[PDB]
């Protein structure tokens, strides 16, 4: 298939891997920090989803250095993946408009 769809699919699979690894790594980093809430895997996975999407309900967040570094990777993976799907949609439309126009 075309590159842009393959990159999107790949980005999605990769995003999902980062969400899972990120939930797990966040708990490892945050336990040991008094006051931390990002300490059980189920809510950490939810946290990873809210981080990759930038939804920002604000109910959970890292307080340690490594928990924050993990958070940054999840954000960037999420922003990039959704940015890449947009770029893929644009490429699709540009090609179609070319066809609809006789080129």
């Amino acid at each position, epitope marked *: 298939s075309a590159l842009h769809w393959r990159a999107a699919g790949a980005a999605t699979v990769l995003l999902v891997i980062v969400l899972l690894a990120g939930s797990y790594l966040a708990v490892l980093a945050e336990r040991g*920090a008094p006051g931390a809430q990002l300490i059980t895997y189920p809510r950490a996975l939810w946290w990873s989803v809210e981080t990759a999407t930038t939804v920002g309900y604000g109910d959970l967040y890292p307080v340690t250095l490594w928990g924050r570094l993990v958070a940054v990777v999840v954000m960037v993976a999420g922003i990039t993946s959704f940015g890449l799907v947009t770029a893929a949609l644009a490429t699709w439309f540009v090609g179609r408009e070319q066809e609809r126009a006789g080129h």
Partner: antibody, heavy 118, light 108 residues
């Protein structure tokens, strides 16, 4: 069948150290945490610390004098707690418990009675 | 760290009566409270998780409720085997902490 196996007792001379063990069977995941809880006679349960065997990381009750050091041997599925320089205050039953990373202690060991005496 | 207060320390009830144990947290912890039962010389046993969720193997008589800072563990129709110490434990913030325990007494 018994999920968590602990020795019945350990006698320790004042000033000496002892290594308690907690052998796990049943389902085992890379995400399990093994906790240790202390209970002095007539008293409640006091959380001592925790360890995730798959990684080797340990956390401790910071609020109490640190008497313990946690380690784990992945090949024998055993978690250990090194108690050092003990006094009669350290005499108590020490439980190990398994937590699936979701906050509660699903199953507990029978406990090891530690007596600090000469 | 979160202080879990269990008062009263001893609860006396008559046979077959509904009984309620109280557990109060120093700050809001959602429903991240779990209950354990510990009979004489036995090890703790999980009774209720996340305030009101059932554990397989535990009698229907046991139930839990509450959210925020105030929690309750109830037993419909107390019977002799229920004589024990009851503890609450939170997992909302690190480190996990335990309540001071409530002993159940039956007046026969």
């Amino acid at each position: 069948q018994v999920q968590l196996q602990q020795p019945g007792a350990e006698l320790v001379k004042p000033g000496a150290s002892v290594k308690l063990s907690c052998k796990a069977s049943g389902y085992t995941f890379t995400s399990d945490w093994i906790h240790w809880v202390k209970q002095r006679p007539g008293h409640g349960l006091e959380w001592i610390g925790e360890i995730i065997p798959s990684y080797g990381r340990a956390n401790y009750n910071e609020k109490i004098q640190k008497k313990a050091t946690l380690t784990a041997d992945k090949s024998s599925s055993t978690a250990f707690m090194q108690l050092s320089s003990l006094t009669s205050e350290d005499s108590a039953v020490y439980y190990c418990a398994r937590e699936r990373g979701d906050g509660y202690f699903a199953v507990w060991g029978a406990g090891t009675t530690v007596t600090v005496s000469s | 760290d979160i202080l879990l207060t269990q008062s009263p320390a001893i609860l006396s009830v008559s046979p077959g009566e509904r009984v309620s144990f109280s557990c109060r947290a120093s700050q809001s912890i959602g429903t991240d409270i779990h209950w354990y039962q510990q009979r004489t010389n036995g090890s703790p046993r999980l009774l209720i998780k996340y305030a009101s969720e059932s554990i397989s193997g535990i009698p229907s008589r046991f139930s839990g409720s509450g959210s925020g800072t105030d929690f309750t563990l109830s037993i419909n129709s107390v019977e002799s085997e229920d004589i024990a110490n009851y503890y609450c434990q939170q997992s909302n913030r690190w480190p996990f902490t335990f309540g001071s325990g409530t002993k159940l007494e039956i007046k026969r």
